[PDB]
Amino acid sequence: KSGTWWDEHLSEENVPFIKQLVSDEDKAQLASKLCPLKDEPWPIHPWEPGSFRVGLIALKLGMMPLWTKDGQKHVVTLLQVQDCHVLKYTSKENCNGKMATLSVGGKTVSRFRKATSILEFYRELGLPPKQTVKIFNITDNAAIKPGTPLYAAHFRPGQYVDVTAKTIGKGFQGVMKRWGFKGQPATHGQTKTHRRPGAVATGDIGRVWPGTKMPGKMGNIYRTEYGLKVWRINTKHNIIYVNGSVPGHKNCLVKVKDSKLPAYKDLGKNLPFPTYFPDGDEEELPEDLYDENVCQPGAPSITFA
Amino acid sequence: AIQKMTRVRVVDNSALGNSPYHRAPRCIHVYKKNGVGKVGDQILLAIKGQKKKALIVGHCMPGPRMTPRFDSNNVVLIEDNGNPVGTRIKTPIPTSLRKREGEYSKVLAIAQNFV
Amino acid sequence: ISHGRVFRRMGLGPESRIHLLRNLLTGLVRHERIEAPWARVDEMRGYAEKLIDYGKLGDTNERAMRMADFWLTEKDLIPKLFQVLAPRYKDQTGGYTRMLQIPNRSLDRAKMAVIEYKGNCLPPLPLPRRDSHLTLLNQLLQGLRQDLRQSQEA
Amino acid sequence: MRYTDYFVIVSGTSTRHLHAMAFYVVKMYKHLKCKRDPHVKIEGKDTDDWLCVDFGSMVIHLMLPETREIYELEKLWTLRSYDDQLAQIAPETVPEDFI
Amino acid sequence: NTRHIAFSGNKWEQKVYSSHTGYPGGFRQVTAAQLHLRDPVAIVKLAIYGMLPKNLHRR
Amino acid sequence: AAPKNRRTIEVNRCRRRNPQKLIKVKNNIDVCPECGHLKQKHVLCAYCYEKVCKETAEIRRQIGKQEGGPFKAPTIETVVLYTGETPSEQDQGKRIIERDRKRPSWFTQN
RNA sequence: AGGGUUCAGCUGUCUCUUACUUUUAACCAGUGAAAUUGACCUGCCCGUGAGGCGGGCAUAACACAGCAAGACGAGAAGACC
RNA sequence: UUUGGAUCAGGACAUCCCGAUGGUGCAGCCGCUAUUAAAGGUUCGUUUGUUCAACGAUUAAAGUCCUACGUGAUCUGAGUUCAGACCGGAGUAAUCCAGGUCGGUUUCUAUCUACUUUCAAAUUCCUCCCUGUACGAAAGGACAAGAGAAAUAAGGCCUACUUCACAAAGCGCCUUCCCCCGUAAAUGAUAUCAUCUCAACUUAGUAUACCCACCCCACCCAAGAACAGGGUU
Numbered sequence A: 001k002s003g004t005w006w007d008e009h010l011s012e013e014n015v016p017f018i019k020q021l022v023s024d025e026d027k028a029q030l031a032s033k034l035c036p037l038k039d040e041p042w043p044i045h046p047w048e049p050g051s052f053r054v055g056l057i058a059l060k061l062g063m064m065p066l067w068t069k070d071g072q073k074h075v076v077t078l079l080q081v082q083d084c085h086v087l088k089y090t091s092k093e094n095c096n097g098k099m100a101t102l103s104v105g106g107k108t109v110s111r112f113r114k115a116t117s118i119l120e121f122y123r124e125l126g127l128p129p130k131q132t133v134k135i136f137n138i139t140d141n142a143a144i145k146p147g148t149p150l151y152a153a154h155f156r157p158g159q160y161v162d163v164t165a166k167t168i169g170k171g172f173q174g175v176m177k178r179w180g181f182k183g184q185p186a187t188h189g190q191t192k193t194h195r196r197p198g199a200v201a202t203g204d205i206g207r208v209w210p211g212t213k214m215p216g217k218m219g220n221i222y223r224t225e226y227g228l229k230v231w232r233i234n235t236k237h238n239i240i241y242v243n244g245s246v247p248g249h250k251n252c253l254v255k256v257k258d259s260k261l262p263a264y265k266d267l268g269k270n271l272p273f274p275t276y277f278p279d280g281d282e283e284e285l286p287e288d289l290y291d292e293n294v295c296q297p298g299a300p301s302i303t304f305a
Numbered sequence B: 001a002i003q004k005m006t007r008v009r010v011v012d013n014s015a016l017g018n019s020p021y022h023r024a025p026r027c028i029h030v031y032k033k034n035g036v037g038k039v040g041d042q043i044l045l046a047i048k049g050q051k052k053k054a055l056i057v058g059h060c061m062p063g064p065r066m067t068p069r070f071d072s073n074n075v076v077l078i079e080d081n082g083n084p085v086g087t088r089i090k091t092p093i094p095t096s097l098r099k100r101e102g103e104y105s106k107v108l109a110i111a112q113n114f115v
Numbered sequence C: 001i002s003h004g005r006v007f008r009r010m011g012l013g014p015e016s017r018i019h020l021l022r023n024l025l026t027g028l029v030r031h032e033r034i035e036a037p038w039a040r041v042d043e044m045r046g047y048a049e050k051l052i053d054y055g056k057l058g059d060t061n062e063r064a065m066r067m068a069d070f071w072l073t074e075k076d077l078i079p080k081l082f083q084v085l086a087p088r089y090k091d092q093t094g095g096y097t098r099m100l101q102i103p104n105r106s107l108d109r110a111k112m113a114v115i116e117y118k119g120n121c122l123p124p125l126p127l128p129r130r131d132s133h134l135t136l137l138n139q140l141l142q143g144l145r146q147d148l149r150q151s152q153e154a
Numbered sequence D: 001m002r003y004t005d006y007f008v009i010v011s012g013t014s015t016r017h018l019h020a021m022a023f024y025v026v027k028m029y030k031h032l033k034c035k036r037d038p039h040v041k042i043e044g045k046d047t048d049d050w051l052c053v054d055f056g057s058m059v060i061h062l063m064l065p066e067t068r069e070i071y072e073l074e075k076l077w078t079l080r081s082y083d084d085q086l087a088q089i090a091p092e093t094v095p096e097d098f099i
Numbered sequence E: 001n002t003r004h005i006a007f008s009g010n011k012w013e014q015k016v017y018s019s020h021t022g023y024p025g026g027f028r029q030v031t032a033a034q035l036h037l038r039d040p041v042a043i044v045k046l047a048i049y050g051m052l053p054k055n056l057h058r059r
Numbered sequence F: 001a002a003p004k005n006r007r008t009i010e011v012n013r014c015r016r017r018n019p020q021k022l023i024k025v026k027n028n029i030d031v032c033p034e035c036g037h038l039k040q041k042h043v044l045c046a047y048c049y050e051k052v053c054k055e056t057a058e059i060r061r062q063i064g065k066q067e068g069g070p071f072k073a074p075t076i077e078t079v080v081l082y083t084g085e086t087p088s089e090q091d092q093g094k095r096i097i098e099r100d101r102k103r104p105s106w107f108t109q110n
Numbered sequence G: 001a002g003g004g005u006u007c008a009g010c011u012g013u014c015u016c017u018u019a020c021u022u023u024u025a026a027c028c029a030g031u032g033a034a035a036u037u038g039a040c041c042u043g044c045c046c047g048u049g050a051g052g053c054g055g056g057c058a059u060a061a062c063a064c065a066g067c068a069a070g071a072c073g074a075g076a077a078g079a080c081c
Numbered sequence H: 001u002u003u004g005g006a007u008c009a010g011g012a013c014a015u016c017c018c019g020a021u022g023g024u025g026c027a028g029c030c031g032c033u034a035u036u037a038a039a040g041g042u043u044c045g046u047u048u049g050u051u052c053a054a055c056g057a058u059u060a061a062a063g064u065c066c067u068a069c070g071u072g073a074u075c076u077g078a079g080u081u082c083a084g085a086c087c088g089g090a091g092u093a094a095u096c097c098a099g100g101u102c103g104g105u106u107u108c109u110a111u112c113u114a115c116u117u118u119c120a121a122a123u124u125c126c127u128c129c130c131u132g133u134a135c136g137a138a139a140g141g142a143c144a145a146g147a148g149a150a151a152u153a154a155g156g157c158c159u160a161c162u163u164c165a166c167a168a169a170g171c172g173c174c175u176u177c178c179c180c181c182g183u184a185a186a187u188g189a190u191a192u193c194a195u196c197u198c199a200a201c202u203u204a205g206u207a208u209a210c211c212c213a214c215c216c217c218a219c220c221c222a223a224g225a226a227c228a229g230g231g232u233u
């Protein structure tokens, strides 16, 4: 009948022991999944038109400028893919949809702040609990065995991706800040009306139409940006340099997948399918995968023609 | 930068642009959708009781990086067809008129300095 | 929208906030232990912590001397600051103050906190202590730790 | 001078001659080579007296002798700041107060 | 076999089924053919619902 | 804006006796291990706090009577000694505050 | 400190608003009004003469913060025969 | 003989522009007419100012209405008109005049209904290639698919600039993905021809995206009015 936490009754001689034990267990579980192709992987199929592959869960670090060989500057957002894994697979018939579904988790958190059901679900999977879980729609030939890690090499430079995340919330806001209403002038006899919306409806209806723009809570909702390309990939740190800005604050979790735009469909022929497997790879990837237009930092000063 | 009723400085050697009272012409219309004139835009001036089209070459408002910022809002007069009224420009002007799309070769040829 | 705002809005303005924090800090310096509303104590804790570092800077330092002169309204406390508190915490590198919550005052049911400098001469507060190592859960965890350690040694 | 490599001034007999010369030179440029570099637009179609074309590194100005006399560009581009007109124009002046 | 019902006359392209979502400009009218293509049981469900008595027992 | 009708007692009950309006019970109450009085888990025990405060007030009264005037803060450490107490070997060069009472059990000397 | 207008400067009056502080505000504790109120178990569209009528549609109960389209909001009184 | 302005606008088409199609002019460029089409847009100012009079410069266009001037418990100007006063006129006078002019206080603590993120398909110009091409005697001058640039709208962001500084913001940056069916045409009896068909028939334009689990005292928070939510390894 009384609430409790993990270290309520633990003594001074036992708190560090528990902390180090759970930390070492989490590290061991994370390291034990680094060889997916040796732990009886699911069959790998060649790429086919009309196939959709799984995405990633990244963390928004920040932004930095990046110049092209044409001398144009573009801002790139750093998305760090850390502790991203596939959790479970659901068939098309069981999901009762047109496409099959796959679950992806990332950014491991403490086991002491999660529900019993989630803890026991992760116990059989043998991974520390993740912060967020997302669902991706894939085809039958894109299935990946559960527990398989994923890396930033899953994407390649020159590929267009879409990013969805919860935007920065602003709480309760007025019409001027929320819907861009112009308000009223500040002088010439105006009486306590400078940001007021003004008229709300017409006099005949005697009501307010549903969906009327009114003050209320703004932000903190899921938004998606489409048509963002990849300029650079850091393999050592598992970092994607996506073009432009992405929704959400710093150190937030963003779901990234291939672009759904019809103008960019059927561009995954050269992309890894169903994903990149460093353990079974014949060759080691370079430290940073650039784009053809990206001027590398080590490259000499660019001279135009 | 430059919009309606904004004083501008005429930089070429046009006799129309030469003001004996040291009065500055002010724009009355900007030939852009949003009415805000950046470098290379075309505006209209009410100068000496005449309405003359003009080409803005530099403005005080900040712009992109590596692009010069001038301490005065500069403009050069143009005719109704594109031939500049003046003959030469003394003050330096940005080279970005080359990159920008428009009828600028005459002004670049009659210009003296670049920044 | 207040994101990243670390300074609370208190008093009649910035000047009033600074003056209230200065008075609380002077009282804490003089008495080695005070009680005050929780928000004000939490705001004053940082200044209290940094004052000890400014004292460690040394009295001969002009900047430290001026800072102490500003932040101590009673001038008899500056020699105390530079000759008692700083030598006491000379060995330590942080955590010079401890703050605890106390029952709400009967006047207006405000949230009250008591803040004191460590090492004072006053009677010890009834500090909250974790469960003893001899309880059932601690004994079981200690047995687990011993077994794991001996297994690793073997 | 940070402008170009070759600056060309050409005087024709008529506006039709200017237009024909511009059309022929741009047609030859498009048909000859350089599929990669950007196209060049005819600059000054509505201007009968003056016409200009700006290639990648060569700029050509077609203009009647009257317009050439009005804007003599040869001395301007040979003498930088040592031109007649430029000398006749004050470099910079600022009005002061009155008495 | 609600998909294989038969409408006498030109009802398949004359009858309409109009609904409003409550938002401005949300007045939508779809013919019998369009409604049958979208949902094969909607015609029969709407017919029986309309013929049922109008009280709390209809649901 | 003026009301158009009198709100009835049934509506008033439905508004006043709503679960949001009701007082929520607390499950963070436990007995103090020392004195046995009730306390909150995150809040210091009122009884122990007030006894410590009274002892501190007496000590501060003694300190003030010893200093005998404002702007007279000493520049040396302070040691509080009760009846039948002597200054310690390491408690030398410190201002001694004498007390005419037995040392409290919870006041563990250093 | 009369009624209009003008030259220059000046400025968030505006282009197009933004940031901060105080007050207000929201929550906790103490004290504690007024106008108003036939009863209400107080929905939408169309029609009729509108929350209460007719035909359809909608529909578990309930608390808090805003909003001012309707309750010819007593609202708000004045003006006209 | 009543009426404007600000803010927010909802709906109708009797469609100003953006869309298809027929006729139509001597080839294109452009024009007129006719059908269908409400998904989207329809500018800034000056003297005035009972909102209509005169306009200037732009744009693809600067559409007509209803909504109790739509909208004043959101604000505001003029009149309905006043209490003071003058000039012109009427009246012996008090006083009056739709005549001309100056000045001149509508107050409100939301009880009820309705609503408070439509969980996302973008619109329009300009420039270059085609191309000085077809076409044209010349004058002139397009197609169709393409590429770039700009503006607005919607949704986000702070790496630079700027307002400013653990952050918010624009003047800054990033992204933006389908049709529209008016009719033009094969074969063919009634009416053995012909006929696109309120004949049986053919052909042309006749979905995906995001949410998808279920310790909490206390502390922190890019989350937040309270509540709720995320983290505390």
Ligand SMILES: [K+]
Residues within 6 Å of the ligand: A200, A208, G067, G068, G069
């Ligand atoms: K409302």
Ligand SMILES: [K+]
Residues within 6 Å of the ligand: G077
């Ligand atoms: K009345």
Ligand SMILES: [Mg+2]
Residues within 6 Å of the ligand: A169, A170, A171, C003, H223
């Ligand atoms: Mg927030």
Ligand SMILES: [Mg+2]
Residues within 6 Å of the ligand: none
């Ligand atoms: Mg915006």
Ligand SMILES: [Mg+2]
Residues within 6 Å of the ligand: A182, A183, A184, A185
């Ligand atoms: Mg404004």
Ligand SMILES: [Mg+2]
Residues within 6 Å of the ligand: A186, A190, A191, A192, A193
């Ligand atoms: Mg005001």
Ligand SMILES: [Mg+2]
Residues within 6 Å of the ligand: A191
């Ligand atoms: Mg007032």
Ligand SMILES: [Mg+2]
Residues within 6 Å of the ligand: C010, C011
């Ligand atoms: Mg205050």
Ligand SMILES: [Mg+2]
Residues within 6 Å of the ligand: none
């Ligand atoms: Mg209040």
Ligand SMILES: [Mg+2]
Residues within 6 Å of the ligand: none
């Ligand atoms: Mg209260």
Ligand SMILES: [Mg+2]
Residues within 6 Å of the ligand: none
């Ligand atoms: Mg009363």
Ligand SMILES: [Mg+2]
Residues within 6 Å of the ligand: none
């Ligand atoms: Mg009801």
Ligand SMILES: [Mg+2]
Residues within 6 Å of the ligand: none
């Ligand atoms: Mg009737």
Ligand SMILES: [Mg+2]
Residues within 6 Å of the ligand: G050
């Ligand atoms: Mg009615």
Ligand SMILES: [Mg+2]
Residues within 6 Å of the ligand: none
């Ligand atoms: Mg009824």
Ligand SMILES: [Mg+2]
Residues within 6 Å of the ligand: none
């Ligand atoms: Mg309410």
